[PDB]
Design a protein around this ligand. Structure first.
Ligand SMILES: [Cl-]
Lengths: 177, 171
């Protein structure tokens, strides 16, 4: 008989992305994002116990119909998103990030949603910390904005696991890394 | 009874794109690109009678030697444009072309010609085979776009390689 089980915990991105690869407009526009009832978002929430936010995403989106009762039922964890006024970009200590993420992964629990904002997401991808990419690719080309993939140093090969199409023309592809 | 039919001719992109939006590496790398017999490429070729190239892209692929796919490709009429590409000249060349009767048109390459036609509102279908690869740098399919383009998704096909071809109409 079984004496122990470890299901390894996963950090998961679940987001809308444009066809030209932007998760958000250049001034934070997300009007083009489409919430569809069949995206498996309730079922995705049930598979997570934690949500990661950087300070700027937490202070805006992070504390406020039924989806929001589930969302806010999750344990919330907040990273620093210092703004460097030199170049007006987010600045992180990557060693702190890895320490904090490992401290979390040490604990028992289910999966972890990396919520935002855009700069923190990007940083997690480039630290090799995202296990699963649930990408709702919208039938729009924004022309400019905040990219999902930026400052990528080598090829990231992915495994496609799910492909889902909606009446809206949105195609969700789920990739495991 | 019928006296005339016109099927309006479509200019179509059919290419491999990475997950992060690149149709080629920095230095022209297409090593990552996957060719599947189930991509409907025989059928796409049968629906076109014309292929558009830039001079740089024609020298590379325009007379390349499945050798049965290439026999079909080479059976098409070819327009080779010269080069920057100037907007007015392409528009004029394309309007001259669209005067003629016949089937659809494959915009083949290269990256800069593809971009010229896109930003001129000249691409009607985008057959995008998205590879499960983040290339990290290269030539983007969508580069220097001045307004939102809204698309109608018409087909989504998956492959055992993890490639996903989504077909879009610019309406
Ligand atoms: Cl943030």
């Amino acid at each position: 008989g079984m004496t122990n089980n470890l299901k390894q915990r996963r950090i998961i991105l679940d987001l809308a992305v444009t066809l030209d690869g932007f998760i958000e407009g250049k001034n934070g526009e997300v009007d083009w994002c489409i919430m569809d009832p069949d995206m498996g978002f309730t079922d995705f929430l049930n598979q997570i116990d934690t949500i990661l936010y950087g300070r700027k995403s937490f202070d805006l989106w992070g504390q406020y119909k039924e989806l929001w009762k589930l969302v806010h039922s999750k344990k919330k964890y907040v990273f620093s998103r210092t703004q460097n006024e030199i170049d007006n970009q987010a600045i992180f200590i990557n060693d702190n990030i890895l320490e904090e993420v490992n401290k979390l992964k040490k604990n028992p629990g289910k999966d972890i949603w990396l919520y935002g904002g855009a700069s923190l997401i990007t940083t997690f991808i480039n630290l090799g910390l995202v296990d699963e990419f649930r990408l709702s690719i919208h039938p729009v080309v924004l022309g400019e904005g905040k990219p999902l993939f930026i400052d990528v140093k080598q090829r990231i090969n992915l495994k496609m696991v799910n492909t889902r199409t909606f009446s809206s023309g949105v195609v969700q592809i789920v990739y495991h890394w």
